[PDB]
Every structure is written in C-alpha cells, then in structure tokens.
C-alpha cells in the first residue's frame, strides 16, 4: 500500500523554470487523489478529457507530472490548442490531451523586492514545438553575415529572457507554479489506481 | 516528512585526527542539505551550504561530501575547540526539518 510521491512534486521548494521543465515519471502507485480535494488554495483544477469527480476510481499505467513557473497571465496558455509564448516556444500540449492542469499563486514564496532573475523563459524558435518536448538550446541565434562569437549585440540575440518577479507587479503578473498531470493508458496492465 | 537519521549518536575522538559523520535521508534530496554546529547553549552557525560549498568565516578544514540520500561530513585535523553537537537539516521538500543531531566530544 505504498503511496506514490505527489509530495515530492507538489510542496517542493525549487520548481525549475519553464524552458527546462523537470518531468517525474510516476509508476506503481496507489494514488490517493483525495489529498488534493482537501487542499483548498488551488486556482484551477481543470481536466481535459477526464472528469474530476471520477478521477479516483479509474486506472492508468503511467502518469507524468511536469512542473514549471509561469506568469499568472500565461496560465491561460497551458491548454489543448492555445497558442502564445509558453505553448509555442516553451511547453505545448497535444489536442487529444487526457490529463489535468493545476495552478498556484506563489507570490509569497518566489519573489524578492529585487528582481528574482533566476526564472527564465524562451523568446523564440525557428519552428514551433512538437508537443511534450523541452528545448535547452543555449546559444545565440545569429541569422547574419557576422559571427559574433558568443557575445550579444546587434543582430545577435540571446534566446532566454528573464522575469522580474517582484511582489508588487500584479495579480496576473506574480508567478504561478503550474503542475501538469498527463495520464496515459498504453497497452499494459494497470498499476496506478486506488 | 523527510526524517533524517544521524549515526552514531555519540563519538569518542582525540585531537589531531579525522572523523566522519552520516546523515541518511529518506527521499532523494540532491545537494539541498546543510550542516550546522552547536556548542553548549549558543546559536548554531552555518558550516557548509548545499552539501559541498564552504562558508567564509569558518576555518578551512570542514568539508563534507556525498549526494543522493547518504551524506557524510568529513572534518580533518580536529581540534579541541570543535566540541559540540552537529546538525544536518534538509531543504528540498516541505516543511524543512533538521536531524536528530550527534555530538563530538573529546577523549
């Protein structure tokens, strides 16, 4: 009756930034989602393809739990089909999505009065992301005759801009920790239940 | 939570030697564990941040190693003024919690 680690991915200290989202492959559960339904402060308990009230009783094989930190405005982009900056260059979901999306309001925990410049986000790519793919390419997009040899300048742009994350920006601009559960049922006897 | 056991509970050492401690975790806590030193009725000080890096102010002999779930604190050329009780305290999941603490006395 070993409980599977939602505690390692929900009340953690350091969520990674959105351009490199850490992904935990959860397996061999007896997954008790009733600890989520007693935790009050969730901004959005949205599920696409599955119902929230029948979530405890159905079985899966592997459940993936991603995690990142985005603006509170950009949560309206962690969704099947929506385009923007987070779902076009950082983290995109497929249109047959069968998981849930949970969001926080961590302005108390992820903000100093100075700029909390740890969290980064991607600005552009040469093509939009295939779904469920991370991109840690850290070099300057040249697109010119000039080899600028790794220092930023004219016609040489770094791809990762940084947030500020002060506690006085805005209720839609203070950082929202977002955890994306994505279930699956591929052709195997089920382990995740209970 | 993350219960952190330290073993052994007591030590019997002599000055001018090396000795090593242990702080075994429960879940995997990658380089987010710290070490604290407390003497008789004082405030604890910070010895090493983030399980490997040392702090300005302390002597340069305290340096612990290891990552994962098993962590050892290695002190070489121990002096007589290193008497006290040593605390390990994780930081990865919530809430933060400190170890049971083992003490380092003198022969």
């Amino acid at each position, epitope marked *: 009756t070993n409980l599977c680690p939602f505690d390692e991915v929900f009340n953690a*200290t350091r969520f990674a930034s959105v351009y490199a989202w850490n992904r935990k492959r959860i397996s061999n559960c007896v997954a008790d989602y009733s600890v989520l339904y007693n935790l009050a402060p969730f901004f959005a308990f949205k599920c696409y393809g599955v119902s929230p009230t029948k979530l405890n009783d159905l079985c899966f094989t592997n459940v993936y739990a991603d995690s990142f930190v985005i603006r509170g405005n950009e949560v309206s982009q962690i969704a099947p089909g929506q385009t923007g900056n987070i779902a076009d260059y950082n983290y995109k979901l497929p249109d047959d999505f069968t998981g849930c999306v949970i969001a926080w309001n961590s302005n*108390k*925990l992820d*903000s*100093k*009065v*100075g700029g*909390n410049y*740890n969290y980064l986000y991607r600005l552009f790519r040469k093509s939009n992301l295939k779904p469920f793919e991370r991109d840690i390419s850290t070099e300057i997009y040249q697109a010119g005759n000039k080899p600028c040899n790794g220092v930023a300048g004219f016609n040489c742009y770094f791809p990762l801009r940084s947030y500020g994350f002060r*506690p006085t920006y805005g209720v839609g601009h203070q950082p929202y920790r977002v955890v994306v559960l994505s279930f699956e049922l591929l052709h195997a006897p089920a382990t995740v239940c209970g | 939570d993350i219960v952190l056991t330290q073993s052994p509970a007591t030590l019997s050492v002599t000055p001018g030697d090396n000795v090593s401690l242990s702080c075994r975790a429960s879940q995997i806590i990658s380089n987010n564990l*710290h070490w*604290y030193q407390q003497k008789s*009725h004082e*405030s*604890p*000080r*910070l010895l090493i*941040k*983030y399980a490997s890096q040392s*702090i300005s102010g302390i002597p340069s002999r305290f340096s612990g190693s290891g990552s994962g779930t098993d962590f050892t604190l290695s002190i070489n050329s121990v002096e007589t003024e290193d008497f006290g009780m040593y*605390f390990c*305290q994780q*930081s990865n999941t919530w*809430p*933060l*919690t*400190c*170890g*049971s*603490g083992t003490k380092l006395e003198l022969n």
Partner: nanobody, 119 residues
Framework: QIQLVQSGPELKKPGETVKISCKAS????????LNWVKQAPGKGLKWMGW????????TYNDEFRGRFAFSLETSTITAYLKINNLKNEDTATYFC????????????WGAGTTVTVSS
C-alpha cells in the same frame, strides 16, 4: 554588523499567553525571510514555519497549525511570535533564524529566549 538579538527570558503560568520579539538590524529586511525554530532541551530542532517579510503572512508547519501567530510590524524592524494557551511541554530556546527567500539555509541566528512554564 548583522545580528538578530531577541527579548530576554520569560516566565508564564499554564493558560497565559506570551509574546516573543525578534528585532533585525543591519540587513535590508525585505531581501530575506525569517524562520523560527523551537528546540526542546535534549532534543533536535523543529522548524516552526517562516514569515514572508514583505507582506507579513505566515506559513505554518503542520505541527504548529493553530495556536501560534507570526505577526509582523515593519515601522520598527521586528518580528513577533505569540503563543496562546501555554501547555506544559513547550519550554525551549525559541530562536529566530534568517533563511533566505531563495536559498533557505539559516546562517545568521539569534541568541534565543526561553519560555519555561510552572506555577
């Protein structure tokens, strides 16, 4: 010069409340957090839960869920701890340790006040 010197020892009866100060001086107060820890004699430290020094809202450990209050005034740079309905086991040396808003290691501590209970 960065230190957090608290109030002196207190002595209260079972049922009376207590109020413990923790005054900061030297560092910019909004740049870091404030963590409280309680250490019963002969035992290990226990984290009491921090307080975000900009807004002033607490975040309690689940052991000390109710019954405590990390209030905060910022006109004078002082944190506050208040224990309602004192019982007979929580005598300790209640420190207050500055752990960061991004790091969470407790480097600059305080001397520590002691609230024993008797009759």
């Amino acid at each position: 010069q960065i230190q957090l010197v608290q109030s002196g020892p207190e002595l209260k009866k079972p049922g009376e409340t207590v109020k413990i100060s923790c005054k900061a001086s030297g560092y910019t107060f909004t740049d870091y957090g404030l963590n409280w820890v309680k250490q019963a004699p002969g035992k290990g430290l226990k984290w009491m839960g921090w307080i975000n020094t900009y807004s002033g809202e607490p975040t309690y450990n689940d052991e000390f869920r109710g019954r405590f209050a990390f209030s905060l005034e910022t006109s004078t740079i002082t944190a506050y701890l208040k224990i309602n309905n004192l019982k007979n086991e929580d005598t300790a040396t209640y420190f207050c340790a500055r752990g960061g808003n991004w790091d969470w290691y407790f480097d600059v501590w305080g001397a520590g006040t002691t609230v024993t209970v008797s009759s």
